[PDB]
Amino acid sequence: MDDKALLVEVQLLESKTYHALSNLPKARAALTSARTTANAIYCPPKLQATLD
Amino acid sequence: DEFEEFPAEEDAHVWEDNWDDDNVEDDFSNQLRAELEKHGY
Amino acid sequence: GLPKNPDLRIAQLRFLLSLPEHRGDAAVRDELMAAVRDNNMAPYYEALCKSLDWQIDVDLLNKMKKANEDELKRLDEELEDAEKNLGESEIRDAMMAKAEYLCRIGDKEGALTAFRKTYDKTVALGHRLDIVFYLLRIGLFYMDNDLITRNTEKAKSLIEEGGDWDRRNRLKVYQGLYCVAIRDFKQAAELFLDTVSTFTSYELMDYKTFVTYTVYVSMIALERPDLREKVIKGAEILEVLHSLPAVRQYLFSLYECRYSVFFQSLAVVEQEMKKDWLFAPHYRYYVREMRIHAYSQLLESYRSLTLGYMAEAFGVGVEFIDQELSRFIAAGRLHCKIDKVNEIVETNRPDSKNWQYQETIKKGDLLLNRVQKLSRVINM
């Protein structure tokens, strides 16, 4: 689905739960995917703040 | 140059077994439980 | 990926039933019987009944035998149809199916001979690898050392000729399991650490079981720096250990030098290890090696320590720690000596020069024995 804002939110959530599970490389990969998807849409201030 | 004067007269495991393996004793959990209850009181 | 036939859970349940304290267990019996009746496994039913002196159910046994007979007739009919009408590929697939059914219904020798005939008729390299992996699984199921070794060599050679990374990783997992089976824990730790990040052989065991095996074997094999770098700081290992608090506590207690908690967790690990079908004969050896490892790790940081200090650290009595220390020094495992009058353990770790000199003496003695033998051989 082309709703990339939801995809960014879910990728950030995946990175968060990976980091909470001590899987640092997987959390970093999920965060990088989230950033790559984020630099293709209009990120609201809340979404950009969560990304940062 | 075989030595024919002296005549040449289950548990088929590959791993090398040390002498302590043959020693019989209770399980380490039992020993630890016993020591824990001995030193607890 | 690969099929779960034969099921190693069946072998684990059978071993647990063979254990004395679990011989009278019922849940193991219920699960094993459910597996057999879902798989219609008659010859292995007979083998289990004769090994455990069980009372065979005549109705269930006859139903299983009739089902096996009609199914085998069906596979033979498909094989004949493929031979008469189709090419070698269909007859090959039919023979693989027959061998797979034979292994599924618990036939050992029949499955072996059918798979050997298929391998004789097998040409495609991937299918040869699959057949060799099936033979390795059967050998692991029956703990056939010769079969496992021969099939491991065959798989290694086949992968060396042509090997995809997936099958090579699976062979690594199988080799690690066998190395665990033969107490070769260093190689098993190597393979398990190499395959933990890309574990895909779910037919052998679940991911959590594989990770517990990896943690145990890496603990018994790796030194402190390697254990810290590859296991303590392991990403996937920590991720799965987040769902295994007991194994995580056991691993982290030794690394953090929490020796009483480590000993309690080691007792728990020994209780788990006794029931394991694969770690069965090595539980005493593993426990002894862990006790020696903990004692050596504690003594590495001290020159002279009171016996009471070890008794408090490990949470045991003075007498028990004294007895274990004396037994391990007598076996030449710990570099220390005990003063029972003062109850002080004084470490006798050789310096770099002394250890180097002793190693030089040993190696030079071996080399000079070889040199003397060679010279006496050649100089007539």
Swiss-Prot record, chain A:
Tissue specificity field: Highly expressed in embryonic stem cells (ESCs). Expression decreases as ESCs differentiate.
UniProt-annotated location(s): Nucleus; Cytoplasm, Cytosol
Induction: By FOXO4; expression in embryonic stem cells (ESCs) is mediated by FOXO4.
Post-translational modification: Phosphorylated by AMPK.
Highest taxon of the lineage: Eukaryota
Purpose of the protein: Component of the 26S proteasome, a multiprotein complex involved in the ATP-dependent degradation of ubiquitinated proteins. This complex plays a key role in the maintenance of protein homeostasis by removing misfolded or damaged proteins, which could impair cellular functions, and by removing proteins whose functions are no longer required. Therefore, the proteasome participates in numerous cellular processes, including cell cycle progression, apoptosis, or DNA damage repair. In the complex, PSMD11 is required for proteasome assembly.
Family: Belongs to the proteasome subunit S9 family.
Oligomer status and interactors: Component of the 19S proteasome regulatory particle complex. The 26S proteasome consists of a 20S core particle (CP) and two 19S regulatory subunits (RP). The regulatory particle is made of a lid composed of 9 subunits including PSMD11, a base containing 6 ATPases and few additional components.
Designated name of the protein: 26S proteasome non-ATPase regulatory subunit 11
Annotated organism of origin: Homo sapiens (Human)
Lineage: Eukaryota, Metazoa, Chordata, Craniata, Vertebrata
Boundaries of the shown chain within the full protein: 160 to 211 of 422
UniProtKB/Swiss-Prot annotation, chain B:
Gene of this entry: SEM1
Superkingdom as given in the UniProt entry: Eukaryota
Subcellular location: Nucleus
Record keywords: Nucleus, Proteasome
Protein name: 26S proteasome complex subunit SEM1
Family designation: Belongs to the DSS1/SEM1 family.
Role description: Component of the 26S proteasome, a multiprotein complex involved in the ATP-dependent degradation of ubiquitinated proteins. This complex plays a key role in the maintenance of protein homeostasis by removing misfolded or damaged proteins, which could impair cellular functions, and by removing proteins whose functions are no longer required. Therefore, the proteasome participates in numerous cellular processes, including cell cycle progression, apoptosis, or DNA damage repair.
Tissue: Expressed in limb bud, craniofacial primordia and skin.
From Swiss-Prot, chain C:
PROSITE patterns for the chain: PCI
UniProt-listed SUPFAM superfamilies: TPR-like, Winged helix' DNA-binding domain
Keyword Metal-binding: no
Domain PCI: start-end pairs: 184-352
Biological process annotations from GO: proteasome-mediated ubiquitin-dependent protein catabolic process
Keywords, sorted A to Z: Proteasome
Cysteines joined through disulfide linkages: none
Classification via InterPro entries: PCI_dom, Rpn7/CSN1, Rpn7_N, RPN7_PSMD6_C, TPR-like_helical_dom_sf, WH_DNA-bd_sf
Record carries keyword Repressor: no
GO CC entries: cytosol; extracellular region; ficolin-1-rich granule lumen; nucleoplasm; proteasome accessory complex; proteasome complex; proteasome regulatory particle; secretory granule lumen
Pfam families cross-referenced by the UniProt entry: PCI, RPN7, RPN7_PSMD6_C
Functional note: Component of the 26S proteasome, a multiprotein complex involved in the ATP-dependent degradation of ubiquitinated proteins. This complex plays a key role in the maintenance of protein homeostasis by removing misfolded or damaged proteins, which could impair cellular functions, and by removing proteins whose functions are no longer required. Therefore, the proteasome participates in numerous cellular processes, including cell cycle progression, apoptosis, or DNA damage repair.
PANTHER family: 26S PROTEASOME NON-ATPASE REGULATORY SUBUNIT 6, 26S PROTESOME SUBUNIT 6
Assembly and binders: Component of the 19S proteasome regulatory particle complex. The 26S proteasome consists of a 20S core particle (CP) and two 19S regulatory subunits (RP). The regulatory particle is made of a lid composed of 9 subunits including PSMD6, a base containing 6 ATPases and few additional components.
Family: Belongs to the proteasome subunit S10 family.
Descriptive protein name: 26S proteasome non-ATPase regulatory subunit 6
